[PDB]
Ligand binder design. Structure first.
Ligand SMILES: [Zn+2]
Ligand SMILES: [Zn+2]
Ligand SMILES: [Zn+2]
Lengths: 71, 258, 66, 59, 115, 47
């Protein structure tokens, strides 16, 4: 009942949710179901990337920039 | 059968280090003054940290370790406070200690940089080196973590721990030209000239000098930021004088008792 | 894992220079120039900015919540 | 973790630097040491002296 | 686990004396001064100052063991000059010299600032 | 009246687990959970 209304991505199960969606898409032989699962996985990946960018906007990104320019 | 009349001359006076020269003194006194500069110099520092909630990734003791190494300015406070060991009360009284507090919690999305600026001190003059150049980074927190604690500062000297070591590095050097032959260079031509060397670029080292005592000791006391260099020198001299006075008093009492 | 507060050998504060060092290296300056631009004369204090490994980032990657 | 980005690895309490290739039995990292032996289907002609034969064509 | 604390290098323990005099029996007018909770800082200057005095025939300290905080100073003067007064005079003149050095350094600093 | 609160594994959400009860989170449902920091006087010496 809690997970019914509580949306899935929050918060640490992003990788687990993506793996479950990928497994469901692989198991499902249908076309519409596979497309929906792929779209959901892409949306989850984009959300995770945006969250990481927001969190890693400073320091975590500047360090990568300095490392690449130094190499 | 008495002491000598040493002379002093400052060559560079700044707010980070001083380069003075002491002439007409024995080597033992100079070396002792150096070791006092490094070891026996009263200064305030963090020595008692009470951690209430530390959700960071580092160890619980890591926070205390880093906080112990954060310098604190004590230009006019070290001479007033007394050693906690010789206190005549209970709990860290402000008359013999300084209280600190740190309460930071990363709420926004970006990662926090908990610096020394977060140390809110109760006293105005006892603050980390942030008056007048980034601040000492303590730890990095991320959304969801926190670091709440309060610590107290006390007076101590380097002989007890490195936290009470104001001087960064003392450049003690005497007799730039190897005149007293205290060191024998196998190939003098292969060595560079000292910064204080008066010898020309032709000759490698000054000639031998049988009847010659070490004089003109050079110093480069470098303050870490807590105590001023000249203040460090004055405190060291006062402490050495106090130690000699106490030794003399003890010797007099021992002789009288016998 | 994290930049120390003071140099082990000398004792000079070096904790408050890691960010400045990274910024100077990023802008245009090189290492050999940035080190003496920050004010590090002795070679013992220069290892703290060259030898130090910044592993706290990888630790922060494992965020507890959210 | 077959060809998985470092993001998920970090989110799954793992690191991308782990070489991997080790079994997990009862929560213990087990590794199989690569044993070496004599190549099969190859003829070897030794000369054992502490025996009655001058030469031996092992295979 | 058995590492000693940091206060046992300078702080006196209940019952331990800061200084003890002990006369030697091998030669006349020779006493060994044993100091507790000190290091080379407080013995090398005294050794040199004693060396300055011509009436002191012998003067030198040592450290029985680096981990132990103790130093023995052996002094031997002429028969008409006891070593106790020699030690007292060395400490007194050393203190005077340090005070004078401090005053000169202070005046030099105060003159250096805008002058 | 201390019901031995716990912290979930991945959710990091507080849970009240008492004796003779299964070890699971109030939501989703996992099998890993850690404890909370003690309430004692955790005092260190910055040495
Ligand atoms: Zn008190
Ligand atoms: Zn150094
Ligand atoms: Zn659960």
């Amino acid at each position: 009942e809690k997970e019914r209304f509580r949306k899935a991505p929050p918060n640490y199960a992003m990788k687990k949710t993506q793996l479950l969606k990928e497994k469901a898409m692989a198991e499902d032989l249908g076309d519409q179901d596979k497309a929906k699962q792929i779209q959901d996985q892409l949306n989850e990946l984009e959300e995770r990337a945006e969250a990481l960018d927001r969190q890693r906007t400073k320091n975590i990104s500047a360090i990568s920039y300095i490392n690449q320019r130094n190499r | 059968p008495y002491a000598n009349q040493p002379t002093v001359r400052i060559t560079e006076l700044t707010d980070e280090n001083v380069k003075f020269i002491i002439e007409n003194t024995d080597l033992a006194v100079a070396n002792s003054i150096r070791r006092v500069f490094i070891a026996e110099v009263p200064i305030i520092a963090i020595d008692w940290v009470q951690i209430d909630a530390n959700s960071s990734v580092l160890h619980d003791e890591f926070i205390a370790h880093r906080l112990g190494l954060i310098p604190l300015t004590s230009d006019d406070i070290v001479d007033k406070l007394q050693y906690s060991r010789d206190c005549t009360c209970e709990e860290f009284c402000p008359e013999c200690s300084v209280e600190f507090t740190l309460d930071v919690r990363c709420n926004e999305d970006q990662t926090r940089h908990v610096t020394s600026r977060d140390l809110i001190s109760n006293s105005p003059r006892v603050i980390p080196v942030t008056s007048r150049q980034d601040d000492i980074l303590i730890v990095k927190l991320r959304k969801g973590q926190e670091l709440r604690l309060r610590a107290y500062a006390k007076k101590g000297f380097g002989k007890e721990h490195a936290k009470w070591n104001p001087t960064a590095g003392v450049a003690f050097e005497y007799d730039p030209d190897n005149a007293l032959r205290h060191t024998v260079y196998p190939k003098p031509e292969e060595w560079p000239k000292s910064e204080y060397s008066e010898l020309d670029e032709d000759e490698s080292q000054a000639p031998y000098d049988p009847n010659g005592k070490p004089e003109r000791f050079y110093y480069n006391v470098e303050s870490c930021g807590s105590l001023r260099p000249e203040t460090i020198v004055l405190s060291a001299l006062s402490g050495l004088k106090k130690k000699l006075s106490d030794l003399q008093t003890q010797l007099s009492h021992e002789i009288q008792s016998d | 894992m994290i930049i120390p507060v003071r140099c082990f050998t000398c004792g000079k504060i070096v904790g408050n220079k890691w960010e400045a060092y990274l910024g100077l290296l990023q802008a245009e300056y090189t290492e050999g120039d940035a080190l003496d631009a920050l004010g590090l004369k002795r070679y013992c204090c220069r290892r703290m900015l060259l030898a130090h490994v910044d592993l706290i980032e990888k630790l922060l990657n494992y965020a507890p919540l959210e | 973790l077959n060809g998985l980005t470092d993001r998920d690895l970090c989110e799954l309490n793992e690191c991308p630097l782990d070489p991997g290739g080790y079994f997990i039995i009862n929560g213990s990292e087990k590794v199989l040491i690569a044993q070496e032996k004599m190549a099969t289907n190859t003829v070897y002609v030794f000369a054992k002296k502490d025996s009655k034969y001058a030469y031996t064509g092992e295979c | 686990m058995n590492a000693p604390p940091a206060f046992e290098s300078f702080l006196l323990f209940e019952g331990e004396k800061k200084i003890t005099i002990n006369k030697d029996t091998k030669v006349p007018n020779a006493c060994l001064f044993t100091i507790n909770k000190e290091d080379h800082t407080l013995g090398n200057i005294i050794k040199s100052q004693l060396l300055k005095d011509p009436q002191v025939l012998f003067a030198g300290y040592k450290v029985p063991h680096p981990l132990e905080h103790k130093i023995i100073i052996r002094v031997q003067t002429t028969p008409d000059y006891s070593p106790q007064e020699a030690f007292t005079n060395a400490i007194t003149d050393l203190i005077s010299e340090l005070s004078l050095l401090e005053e000169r350094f202070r005046v030099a600093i105060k003159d250096k600032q805008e002058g | 009246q201390q019901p031995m609160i716990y912290i979930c594994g991945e959710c990091h959400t507080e849970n009240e687990i008492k004796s003779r009860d299964p070890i699971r989170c109030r939501e989703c449902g996992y099998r890993i959970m850690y404890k909370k920091r003690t309430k004692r006087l955790v005092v260190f010496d910055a040495r």
